[PDB]
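Here is one chain, start to finish.
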Amino acid sequence: FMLEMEIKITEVKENKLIGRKEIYFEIYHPGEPTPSRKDVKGKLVAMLDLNPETTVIQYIRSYFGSYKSKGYAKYYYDKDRMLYIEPEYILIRDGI
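Its structure:
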């Protein structure tokens, strides 16, 4: 097969007041450049059984010295809440 990216969930926090999951994870992308936010979102959603419409990658940090990247995503239980909280540039950037 071809080299695949792998997500490791390191932490999920349930934010009751805001109504979201706060999700920290590692991406291992061996023999490959850092993957796109798009592909990273696809794996995370698949992995956690999440609606992609309300899954918001905030950042993905990479390191020149390794094939592991570290990301932060928020998942909103309600779309309209997402829209009130998240800046439009972030939502646009993330395919939302």
